[PDB]
């Protein structure tokens, strides 16, 4: 039932499910971060990404993920779904994307 793309409520890092592992992987930072943050938010049912940033595994931690996924930037603009343009990678920089998507569907009363 969990959706394969998730975002953390502690630091907005994006996590994508790797079905051959049964683990979540981080999304390596790229020059297409804005399009990837926008596409990840749409994918999950949010309207848009308000902002995104770049975290550092060395100062932020992994938070239970196993590896990285990288986006094929040249294919990225032909996509509707993120999972079809992503691949495992080494992400040598150890920097991943965090996305602040527009919040929705929750009541804010006591």
């Amino acid at each position: 039932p969990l959706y394969p793309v998730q975002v953390s409520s502690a630091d907005a890092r994006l996590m994508v499910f790797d079905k051959t592992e049964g683990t979540w992987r981080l999304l390596c930072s790229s020059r297409s971060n804005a399009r990837v943050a926008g596409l990840s938010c749409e994918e999950m049912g949010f309207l848009r990404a308000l902002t995104h940033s770049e975290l550092d595994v060395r100062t932020a931690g992994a938070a239970g993920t196993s590896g990285f996924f990288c986006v094929d930037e040249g294919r990225l603009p032909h996509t509707q779904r993120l999972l079809e343009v992503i691949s495992v990678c080494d992400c040598p920089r150890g920097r991943f994307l965090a996305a602040i998507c527009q919040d929705c569907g929750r009541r804010k009363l006591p």
């Binding site: 039932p1 969990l2 959706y3 793309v5 998730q6 975002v7 409520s9 749409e42 994918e43 999950m44 049912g45 949010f46 309207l47 848009r48 509707q80 779904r81 527009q102 919040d103 929705c104 569907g105 929750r106 009541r107 804010k108 009363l109």
Partner: protein, 248 residues
Amino acid sequence: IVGGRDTSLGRWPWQVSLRYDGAHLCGGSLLSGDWVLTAAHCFPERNRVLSRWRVFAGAVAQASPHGLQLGVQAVVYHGGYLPFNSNDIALVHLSSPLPLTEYIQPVCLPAAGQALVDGKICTVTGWGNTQYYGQQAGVLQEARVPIISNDVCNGADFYGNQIKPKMFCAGYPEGGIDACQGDSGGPFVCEDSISRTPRWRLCGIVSWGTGCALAQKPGVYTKVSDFREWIFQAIKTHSEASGMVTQL
């Protein structure tokens, strides 16, 4: 809403009322502080002077002096809405954004690939008639109805082949609880925890039916999951638009 109950402030913070020259005509759902998703049939030829439309939000009583009322900058409707019933969806861009408070919040969209669960019980809200030959509700009403399958709804005893693939029915075979005139454009929402947090998502838009709350004539909704890309497009494309525009 026929067979529903009065609800309270902050429960369905995405619900808005669309009024034309003073009268409440349709319901709508906030997608952000400046965009509302409703039904294309709410803007027929005679109701296309944007200056005459207002969007009321943040209150459950139509006569609350504490709700906000903003103008409309543009209406983007679906070019496939032949009448101008499939593609009965439209987006309304407010002239300025609503603040988001504990009483004004956007609702979520279905995630990509997320499908409807036939039999699941969702909620439908609105200020439409509480009886077909009745009056609109003074306080927003809410009701729970299950999704009916298309095989059943298209049966000759229900809507005999009039339910096309981007619409769905929700209701009780028996009748009794249903949406009605004035609820059109409004929200049909289901709650799930796929994002690990329970969130309500807009699965349907109140569109039409034969009378209201009759047995075997359930309500028909526009299936939002099939318009996700149209919505994302429209909003990028027409963010700075004014007027009545159509996007296919």
